Ligand binder design. Structure first.
Ligand SMILES: *[C@@H]1O[C@H](CO)[C@@H](O[C@@H]2O[C@H](CO)[C@@H](O[C@@H]3O[C@H](CO[C@H]4O[C@H](CO)[C@@H](O)[C@H](O[C@H]5O[C@H](CO)[C@@H](O)[C@H](O)[C@@H]5O)[C@@H]4O)[C@@H](O)[C@H](O[C@H]4O[C@H](CO)[C@@H](O)[C@H](O)[C@@H]4O[C@H]4O[C@H](CO)[C@@H](O)[C@H](O)[C@@H]4O[C@H]4O[C@H](CO)[C@@H](O)[C@H](O)[C@@H]4O)[C@@H]3O)[C@H](O)[C@H]2NC(C)=O)[C@H](O)[C@H]1NC(C)=O
Ligand SMILES: *[C@@H]1O[C@H](CO)[C@@H](O[C@@H]2O[C@H](CO)[C@@H](O[C@@H]3O[C@H](CO[C@H]4O[C@H](CO)[C@@H](O)[C@H](O[C@H]5O[C@H](CO)[C@@H](O)[C@H](O)[C@@H]5O[C@H]5O[C@H](CO)[C@@H](O)[C@H](O)[C@@H]5O)[C@@H]4O)[C@@H](O)[C@H](O[C@H]4O[C@H](CO)[C@@H](O)[C@H](O)[C@@H]4O[C@H]4O[C@H](CO)[C@@H](O)[C@H](O)[C@@H]4O)[C@@H]3O)[C@H](O)[C@H]2NC(C)=O)[C@H](O)[C@H]1NC(C)=O
Ligand SMILES: *[C@@H]1O[C@H](CO)[C@@H](O[C@@H]2O[C@H](CO)[C@@H](O[C@@H]3O[C@H](CO[C@H]4O[C@H](CO)[C@@H](O)[C@H](O[C@H]5O[C@H](CO)[C@@H](O)[C@H](O)[C@@H]5O)[C@@H]4O)[C@@H](O)[C@H](O[C@H]4O[C@H](CO)[C@@H](O)[C@H](O)[C@@H]4O[C@H]4O[C@H](CO)[C@@H](O)[C@H](O)[C@@H]4O)[C@@H]3O)[C@H](O)[C@H]2NC(C)=O)[C@H](O)[C@H]1NC(C)=O
Ligand SMILES: *[C@@H]1O[C@H](CO)[C@@H](O[C@@H]2O[C@H](CO)[C@@H](O[C@@H]3O[C@H](CO[C@H]4O[C@H](CO)[C@@H](O)[C@H](O)[C@@H]4O)[C@@H](O)[C@H](O[C@H]4O[C@H](CO)[C@@H](O)[C@H](O)[C@@H]4O[C@H]4O[C@H](CO)[C@@H](O)[C@H](O)[C@@H]4O)[C@@H]3O)[C@H](O)[C@H]2NC(C)=O)[C@H](O)[C@H]1NC(C)=O
Ligand SMILES: *[C@@H]1O[C@H](CO)[C@@H](O[C@@H]2O[C@H](CO)[C@@H](O[C@@H]3O[C@H](CO[C@H]4O[C@H](CO)[C@@H](O)[C@H](O)[C@@H]4O)[C@@H](O)[C@H](O[C@H]4O[C@H](CO)[C@@H](O)[C@H](O)[C@@H]4O[C@H]4O[C@H](CO)[C@@H](O)[C@H](O)[C@@H]4O)[C@@H]3O)[C@H](O)[C@H]2NC(C)=O)[C@H](O)[C@H]1NC(C)=O
Ligand SMILES: *[C@@H]1O[C@H](CO)[C@@H](O[C@@H]2O[C@H](CO)[C@@H](O[C@@H]3O[C@H](CO[C@H]4O[C@H](CO)[C@@H](O)[C@H](O)[C@@H]4O)[C@@H](O)[C@H](O[C@H]4O[C@H](CO)[C@@H](O)[C@H](O)[C@@H]4O)[C@@H]3O)[C@H](O)[C@H]2NC(C)=O)[C@H](O)[C@H]1NC(C)=O
Ligand SMILES: *[C@@H]1O[C@H](CO)[C@@H](O[C@@H]2O[C@H](CO)[C@@H](O[C@@H]3O[C@H](CO[C@H]4O[C@H](CO)[C@@H](O)[C@H](O)[C@@H]4O)[C@@H](O)[C@H](O[C@H]4O[C@H](CO)[C@@H](O)[C@H](O)[C@@H]4O)[C@@H]3O)[C@H](O)[C@H]2NC(C)=O)[C@H](O)[C@H]1NC(C)=O
Ligand SMILES: *[C@@H]1O[C@H](CO)[C@@H](O[C@@H]2O[C@H](CO)[C@@H](O)[C@H](O)[C@H]2NC(C)=O)[C@H](O)[C@H]1NC(C)=O
Ligand code: NAG
Ligand code: NAG
Ligand code: NAG
Ligand code: NAG
Ligand code: NAG
Lengths: 126, 453, 126, 126, 48, 48
């Protein structure tokens, strides 16, 4: 079924993790007024690129869902699988992990370059 | 399996509250208006032929209309937009001159004061060499006695400069939509009993707001969108008298307004290129500007606000209505534009009541100005050219900006009075449904999954 | 051989599918006049990103040629392989499939997220 | 250890090839003055995209380190491995290979599309 | 070193009477010219 | 003491101090200002 942009707001993080390509979709394309238009037109690509920037300095240029090699520090959440994917919503979930998102991102940054520096060595010997 | 791994999500439905520059949208008929008249309709992007607002099920959102930006943004857009329009329009620098004025040809009773002063004055010519004595007609409010001749001056001459609006422009309020950038949403409280502050159960995302036309008016606000069920009375702090009350009607109360005089306009060559639009002879009778509302419906609708008001002040309470306490003409009277000229209608007749716990119309007089000083002007003013012919407009009353008397003493007789002043209240009145948020799609959460080697 | 940007305009869709990296190349880098420059400079990245947007919400961030899992509805064209790759030109070909390109894109959108939601389950069990 | 943006300026090309994700990081996010801000805001995404443009018309959208199929013309440098990775710095190294970087890029451009045109044939038969 | 790549085997339906870049140009010329006169002195009192 | 070309007299010398040398300055007269209405809006600030 097709709900709409942001339609799975109050949906469980499992059901909301279905409709990802819809929120990712309506995110780019869509003299007084003339200037408003221009610093809104750049703001949208700046804000968009800053996310692709992250996905790219991780390994997740795929993208949508992307697994990684940094293990989940229980201190961050510690909740069980069911009670976040089949229970909580992303609006809710965001505020819990909010305290360490940038610290989590740092774990990701080092881990990706570590992968690359390694994979060169594999293709080097083989 | 016990070991969990974070996996990142792109396209997660979540937003943070924000502020940002929005942009305008209008429709094709606004450009079909042509005549080089409407402001900023041209630079303004179009609307959508098939607009969609996606309802968001199972979510609540904490709105607050008294701490919004897009009304401050709008208020600003309106002031700027307007002020950019007057740059080309001609300057009435030399019209600031010692006028020699009399009364208009009339046989009225002594009690009735003369509000139309026939003023003759040395005006400038196309050539620097010469001058020209020429006459024009001015309202009593647009002039001041300067000082056995009866000589006057345009009132702006000591406060501010003056610039004549291009007649090739229009003051008609046309519907504007405030569209968000990408990765920005506007959230719409679809609850039909919302007071503007707190959690809203029924919510929807949407790109642009509805067609919000910029009616700039004091006392009663007009032609606005009206409530779906009840006459909602909204305020920031109701208990505190210092804060005004925004009444949003349920039913429209149609109010007809007019300038009965068939006024005429002559054009005076300031030269070169500059040209002042004087007010010429009055063709026919000399009558009085006014507005009519049904006494029946006003009774009916003033009864609705009282039924609502007692929910805040007690069931066994008297709620009477009184006229303005005192202040500027900008606020002591229902101000508006009508056909291209500015009105100042005495609201004493409307706010003159009393309400216990348990077929003609209301003629209400008006005044008219041409040199106006809206939006609390200080250094600049604007001369609104004479609009030739007879003028009449018909409009609904959508709301009120009422004010309670703080004397109190726990009396069950707290009365109300119409207010105005700050014009953000008007956009506050229409934008209560909306809120702007920043979209953040990068979710991160643990699922039992490791990426390959 | 090297024809030039758009040189394979009147070339067969097979021969034109060789020189893809040339059209993809000259596509980014290359006060009255000053404003013209600015709303042309943003227009070019907006228009460019809107294509990367699509390639990314499909699986084709590669990119150039990218195969997929949505099968060709014969109703769209129904022509044989030879008579489009060794015959028709893209200018020509575009106008035939033009009636359903956005409907085709929708088939792609769901198919990619469907891949991701699936591939997580593979790495999950393994 | 964490040096900082550009910290491995005078570090060996091996040690500088560790901290790549730091220079790649601080590269996007970070009325007289108002215009300055705007043509700096676009300049940064134009300049950024022009690099992603290259990585994408090669196979290296990964990215950071990316191996390829164009062999090293000794004429370009001819130095031994040790004396560039465990010796020279990128500031230094850049000026040597500077004379042919755009010629080298051209070798890359053809090589990628050549890969794609080939890989379709593999998935075609299989 | 300007380059114009010839496109072999293709035809294109031109119409110069329904073009924009001449309307754009015409406009650019009028604007460009009118912005030049802002600093230039006003002969207001020469009208005599 | 910094300069582009020190040997050439045509180029100035930029001296950058090591220690601050505090210099106190003043207009001792208690001047007064009156405002003159050019009108309207225009207003010249005369020295009283
Ligand atoms: C547009 O611009 C127009 C042009 O600028 C302007 O029109 C002018 O308006 C002014 C003011 O209204 C006019 O001035 C008056 O003119 C009266 C007419 O007299 C003329 O014709 C006479 C023949 O019939 C001539 O005799 C006379 O000139 C003679 O008198 C001079 C007196 O000094 C002398 O110097 C000359 O050499 C010559 O001999 C003139 O040409 C004139 O009568 C009038 O004087 C008094 O009477 C007026 C009523 O008629 C009074 O309104 C006025 O106030 C004067 O009384 C003065 O004297 C009293 C006794 O001493 C005092 O108590 C008074 O306070 C007052 O004193 C003031 O005025 C004195 C002027 O004499 C001055 O010297 C004092 O210092 C003090 O300030 C007066 O001169 C002028 O004629 C008009 N011009 C034209 C071409 O029409 C018009 O108003 C502008 N606005 C508009 C909307 O159009
Ligand atoms: C709350 O909302 C209400 C509802 O909208 C507001 O009421 C509005 O008030 C406006 C005034 O403030 C008022 O606008 C004026 O209307 C005058 C009356 O004439 C118009 O309206 C009639 C119908 O009422 C219409 O028949 C006329 O023409 C129709 O036909 C011609 C072709 O013959 C069309 O060109 C025209 O668009 C219109 O089309 C209609 O009929 C066809 C079928 O034939 C339909 O298919 C269409 O859909 C359409 O319904 C008139 O349009 C009018 O005289 C005024 O005109 C002056 O101002 C406009 C500004 O845009 C300008 O273009 C004019 O040229 C003229 O100004 C200039 O000319 C003067 C001399 O000619 C000169 O003196 C001036 O200085 C200028 O130079 C003006 O249009 C408006 O009509 C009503 N709304 C409605 C629905 O009637 C109310 O104001 C709001 N409240 C507040 C507080 O704002
Ligand atoms: C703010 O302004 C608005 C408007 O701007 C005001 O609202 C208006 O209020 C008036 C009444 O106050 C409304 O008029 C009503 O119209 C009714 C319908 O009339 C039409 O249909 C009949 C057939 O039934 C036609 O015959 C009519 O045409 C004839 O009349 C016109 C002139 O009116 C001529 O020009 C034509 O050539 C025709 O000859 C209309 O098309 C009408 O029924 C109603 O009352 C009539 O009937 C009663 C009896 O019940 C009579 O007593 C009365 O005198 C009227 O008689 C007219 O109609 C009969 C036929 O029914 C004719 O034979 C007569 O000769 C006579 O013309 C009344 O006239 C108007 O519709 C309404 N407009 C809007 C938009 O709301 C607000 O009140 C005002 N508010 C404030 C606060 O100021
Ligand atoms: C917004 O709107 C409000 C309300 O309309 C308005 O307030 C009113 O302002 C006017 C002044 O502009 C007040 O003045 C009244 O004017 C009328 C008209 O005068 C005619 O009639 C008198 C004789 O009655 C003649 O002399 C005159 O030449 C005119 O022909 C007067 O009639 C009013 O006077 C009454 O009160 C006097 C004092 O009590 C009496 O002597 C007189 O007879 C009038 O009768 C009243 O008293 C009688 C007993 O003595 C009683 O039987 C009558 O029923 C009546 O009550 C008065 O001078 C007017 O009062 C204001 N209205 C109110 C309700 O206060 C605002 O001014 C307006 N906003 C602005 C900014 O102006
Ligand atoms: C807001 O809207 C209201 C209407 O809702 C409108 O009010 C109108 O005001 C005028 C006055 O300006 C009313 O006209 C008369 O007002 C007098 C006032 O009398 C009082 O004051 C005198 C002293 O001056 C006292 O002596 C007296 O006791 C009152 O306190 C009224 O007395 C008049 O009504 C009499 O006649 C009626 C008809 O016969 C009787 O039914 C009524 O009971 C009154 O008789 C009383 O007084 C007599 C002496 O006068 C006495 O002998 C009797 O025994 C009895 O006690 C009259 O009303 C006008 O009527 C008001 N309108 C309505 C619909 O009533 C405001 O003008 C308006 N304001 C604005 C700004 O728009
Ligand atoms: C709608 O608006 C009304 C007011 O119009 C609000 O109602 C008031 O609410 C407050 C509490 O929120 C009540 O409490 C009073 O607070 C005063 C604070 O003022 C002191 O602190 C400021 C800090 O800057 C000083 O500048 C100032 O000089 C004061 O020192 C107290 O002064 C009040 O009196 C108490 O202190 C004095 C000594 O100072 C004692 O003598 C008194 O006995 C008493 O202990 C008091 O505490 C206040 O009473 C309410 N007023 C009314 C009229 O209701 C609503 O809260 C608001 N609604 C919302 C939703 O905000
Ligand atoms: C700081 O500034 C000082 C000067 O203030 C510089 O010192 C001078 O340095 C130059 C060399 O760099 C010395 O050499 C002289 O050069 C002159 C060049 O002028 C000729 O060429 C130009 C080219 O356009 C002609 O326009 C011009 O007419 C001249 O024809 C020579 O003219 C000098 O004289 C020589 O030529 C003539 C014939 O023309 C012979 O007769 C002489 O014998 C001699 O052979 C001379 O060659 C110059 O002397 C220096 N002057 C001083 C005062 O020191 C510094 O270099 C500068 N510092 C830095 C860091 O740049
Ligand atoms: C012209 O209008 C003026 C008012 O602007 C008239 O003078 C006033 O008339 C009112 C009438 O009630 C009185 O209250 C004032 O006292 C009058 N003014 C003065 C100074 O007494 C004037 O009568 C009208 N006619 C003419 C010819 O000027
Ligand atoms: C992460 O988990 C370990 C144990 O699993 C714990 O010691 C550590 O404190 C946690 N991290 C934080 C920041 O608390
Ligand atoms: C409302 O209308 C009724 C109708 O008769 C009228 O009697 C009453 O006085 C009106 N209300 C008030 C407060 O006057
Ligand atoms: C006032 O009394 C009415 C009586 O019907 C009741 O319905 C209403 O809820 C009461 N409101 C308040 C605020 O007490
Ligand atoms: C796609 O093909 C099927 C049969 O292969 C056909 O039934 C269907 O109508 C086609 N789609 C459209 C849109 O015609
Ligand atoms: C590349 O190397 C070959 C031999 O390996 C040499 O002949 C050729 O000249 C080199 N390229 C250049 C541009 O010198």
């Amino acid at each position: 079924v097709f709900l709409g942009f942001l339609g799975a707001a109050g949906s469980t993080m499992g059901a909301a993790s279905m409709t990802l390509t819809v929120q990712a979709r309506n995110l780019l394309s869509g003299t007084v007024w003339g200037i408003k238009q221009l610093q809104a037109r750049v703001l949208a690509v700046e804000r968009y690129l800053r996310d692709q920037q992250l996905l790219g300095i991780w390994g997740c240029s795929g993208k949508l869902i992307c697994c990684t090699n940094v293990p989940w520090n229980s201190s961050w959440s510690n909740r069980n699988l069911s009670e976040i994917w089949d229970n909580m919503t992303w609006l809710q979930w965001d505020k819990e992990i909010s305290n360490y998102t940038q610290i989590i991102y740092g774990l990701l940054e080092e881990s990706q370059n570590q992968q690359e520096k390694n994979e060169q060595d594999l293709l080097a010997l083989d | 399996a016990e070991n969990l791994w974070v996996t990142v999500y792109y396209g997660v439905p979540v937003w943070k509250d924000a502020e940002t520059t929005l942009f305008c949208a209008s429709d094709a008929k606004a450009y079909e208006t042509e005549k080089h008249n409407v402001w900023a309709t041209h630079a303004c992007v179009p609307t959508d032929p098939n607009p969609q607002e996606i309802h968001l099920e199972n979510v609540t959102e904490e709105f607050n209309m008294w701490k919004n930006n897009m009304v401050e943004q709008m208020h600003t857009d309106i002031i700027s937009l307007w002020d950019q329009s007057l740059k080309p329009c001609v300057k009435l620098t030399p019209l600031c001159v010692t006028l020699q004025c009399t009364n208009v040809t009339n046989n009225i009773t002594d009690d009735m004061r003369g509000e139309l002063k026939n003023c003759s004055f040395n005006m400038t010519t196309e050539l620097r060499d010469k001058k020209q004595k020429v006459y024009s007609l001015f309202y009593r409010l647009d002039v001041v006695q300067i000082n056995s001749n009866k000589e006057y001056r345009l009132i702006n001459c000591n406060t501010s400069a003056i610039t004549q609006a291009c007649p090739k422009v229009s003051f008609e309020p046309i519907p504007i939509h405030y569209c968000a950038p990408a990765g920005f949403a506007i959230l719409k409280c679809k609850d039909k009993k919302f007071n503007g502050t707190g959690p809203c159960p029924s919510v929807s995302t949407v790109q642009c707001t509805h067609g919000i036309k910029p009616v700039v008016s004091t006392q009663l606000l007009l032609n606005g969108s009206l409530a779906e069920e009840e006459v909602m009375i909204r305020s920031e702090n109701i208990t505190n008298n210092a804060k005004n009350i925004l009444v949003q009607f349920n039913t429209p109360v149609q109010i007809n307004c007019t300038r009965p005089n068939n006024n005429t306009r002559k054009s005076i060559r300031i030269g070169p290129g500059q040209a002042f639009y004087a007010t010429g002879d009055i063709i026919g009778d000399i009558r009085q500007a006014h507005c009519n509302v049904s006494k029946a419906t006003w009774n009916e609708t003033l009864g609705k606000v009282v039924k609502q008001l007692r929910k805040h002040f007690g069931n066994n309470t008297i709620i009477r209505f009184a006229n303005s306490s005192g202040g500027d003409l900008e606020v002591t009277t229902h101000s508006f534009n009508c056909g291209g000229e500015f009105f100042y209608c005495n609201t004493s007749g409307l706010f003159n009541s009393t309400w216990i716990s348990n077929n003609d119309s209301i003629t209400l007089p008006c005044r008219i100005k041409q040199i106006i000083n809206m939006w609390q002007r200080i250094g600049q003013a604007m001369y609104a050219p004479p609009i030739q012919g007879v003028i009449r407009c018909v409009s609904n009353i959508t709301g009120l900006i009422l004010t309670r008397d703080g004397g109190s003493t726990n009396s069950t007789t707290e009365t109300f009075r119409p207010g105005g002043g700050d014009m953000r209240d008007n956009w506050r009145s229409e934008l209560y449904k909306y809120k702007v948020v920043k979209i953040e799609p990068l979710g991160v959460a643990p699922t039992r999954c490791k990426r390959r080697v």
